[PDB]
C-alpha cells in the first residue's frame, strides 16, 4: 500500500476514535440515554479498535502484513457496525449523524488499504 | 456463553500486554537493539491489540458477535506473530522467551473463545 | 522500585479493564440515566490507566518528570472514579468492585510517586 | 462556556496531529541505521502519542465534567509534549522526521497550556 494512503488511513482512525468518543458522551447526556446504550457501547468498541489500528498501521513495514490485514479487517468490521448503529439515530441526533459519517470514512479507508495490501 | 473462557481470555490479554511491553522496553535497552526492531514493533502491536481486545470482550451491552469475532481473530493473529518473532530471540534474551510464552497462551485463549462462541 | 513499577503497570491494566466492565454494566442497568457520571468517569479512568501502563513500561529514570506527571494524572482520575463508583456501590456490586480496583491503582501510583521523589 | 469549548476543540485537534507526528517519528527512528542512538526519542514519542490520544478522549467528554481530572490530564499532556519536543529537537538537524515531530509537540504543548490557563 501507498505510504500516503497509510498516513490517510491512520488519520481516519485517530479521527474516528475521537468522533466515537464525542458521540458516546453526547448520548450519555441525552434524556433518552436508555435508548442509546448500544450506540454508546459500539462507539466505545470502535474507539478502542481504531486507536489500536492507528498504532499498528504506524509501524507497518510490509513484513508480517498478516498482522496489518487482521487489524484492518477488525477495524473495518467495527467501524461498519458503529456506523450502522449511529445511522439508526442520525435523524434524531446530529451527533450520531456526524459519527456515522466518520465511521463510514474510516471503514472505507480500511477497506481500501486491505484491497491494496 | 462460555463465560469462564471469556474471563480467561481477558486475563490472558492483560498478562500478554504487560509481557509484550516489558519485552519491547528490554529490547530497546539492548546493545543489539538494531537487530531487535521487528521484535519491538510486533511487541507494541500485540500489546495495543491485547488491551483493545480485553476492553471489547469486557462489554456485554448490545453485544455483536461480528465485532467480537473480528477482534478475537485479530488478537489471535497478532499474538501468533509476536510469539514467532520473540521465539527467534528467546535463546539470547530471557525477556523474549517470557514474552513468547505469554503470546502463545493468549493466542490459545483467543482461539478457544472463538471456537466456543 | 522495579518491582513497584511492575506492580503499578499491572494495576493500571487491571483498573482499565475494571472500569470498562463497570461502565458496560451501568449501560445495561434500567436506571442507566442515574449512572451517567459513573460511566463517563469510568471511561476517563480506563483511557488514562491505559496510557499510564504504557508510559510506565518505558520509564528509564532520566525524564522522571514525564513519569511523575502521568502518575499524578492517573492517581487523580483513579481517585475521582473511585469516589463516583462508591456512590453506587451499595446498589450495584459492579460499582463496588470497580471502586476497589480504582483504589488499588491509585495507591500503586502514589507509592511510585513517593519512591521517585 | 463558549471560548472554553473552542479551546478544547483546538487542543483535541492538536493532540490528534501530535499523536500521528509522534508515531511517524517513532517508526522512522526504528528504521534508521543509527536506531541505537534514538531509543529515548522512540520511547518519548510513544509516551507522547499515548498521552495525546487519552487527552483528546478526556477533552471530548462533557457529561459529568470534573475540572480537576481534566486539568491533571492536560498537565500530563503538556509535560510529555514538552519532553518529546526536547528530545526530537536534539535530532532535528540530522532527521527531518524529528524536526517535524518537535514542531507538532510544541504546538500541542501550547494548546494544552492555553487550556490549563483558561479553565482554572
Ligand atoms: Cu452510534
Ligand atoms: Cu448514536
Ligand atoms: Cu450520537
Ligand atoms: Cu454515534
Ligand atoms: Cu524481549
Ligand atoms: Cu518479545
Ligand atoms: Cu524479542
Ligand atoms: Cu463508577
Ligand atoms: Cu458499576
Ligand atoms: Cu464503577
Ligand atoms: Cu458505577
Ligand atoms: Cu523525538
Ligand atoms: Cu527523534
Ligand atoms: Cu524522528
Ligand atoms: Cu521525534
Describe the structure.
The structure is a homotetramer. Chain A is mainly α. Chain A is built from 4 helices and no strands. Chain A has helices at 3-28, 37-58, 65-89, 94-116. The first copy, chain A, is elongated and about 50 Å long. Chains in contact: A-B, A-C, A-D, B-C, B-D, C-D. The interface between A and B is medium-sized, with 28 and 25 residues. Bound molecules: copper (I) ion (15 copies). One copper (I) ion (CU1) binds at residues 23, 39, 42-43, 82, 85-86, 96, 99 of chain A. Residues 25, 28-29, 88, 95, 97-98, 101 of chain D line the site of one copper (I) ion.
What's this model, at a glance?
Chain A has 117 residues and is mainly alpha-helical.
Keywords:
mainly alpha, Csp_YhjQ (chains A, B), metal-binding (chains A, B), homotetramer, binds copper (I) ion, 117 residues
Write the layout of secondary structure elements.
4 copies of one chain form a homotetramer.
Chain A: H1 3-28, H2 37-58, H3 65-89, H4 94-116
The structure holds copper (I) ion (15 copies).
One copper (I) ion binds at residues 22, 25-26, 92, 94-95, 98 of chain C.
How many H/I helical runs of chain A? 4
Strand percent estimate of chain A: under 5%
Overall outline of chain A: elongated
Q: Total domains of chain A, how many?
A: 1
State the secondary-structure class of chain A: mainly alpha
Gap from first CA to last CA of chain A? 5 Å
Present as ligands are:
copper (I) ion
- Largest interface here, residues on each chain? A-B, 28 and 25 residues
Order of helix and strand elements from N to C terminus of chain A? HHHH
How would a textbook summarize the main sheet of chain A?
none
What oligomeric state do these chains adopt?
homotetramer
What is the radius of gyration of chain A?
14 Å
Number of strands of chain A: 0
PDB class: metal binding protein
Keywords: Copper, cytosolic, storage protein, Streptomyces livdians, metal binding protein
Assembly: tetrameric
Entry title: Copper loading to a cytosolic copper storage protein from Streptomyces lividans (five coppers)
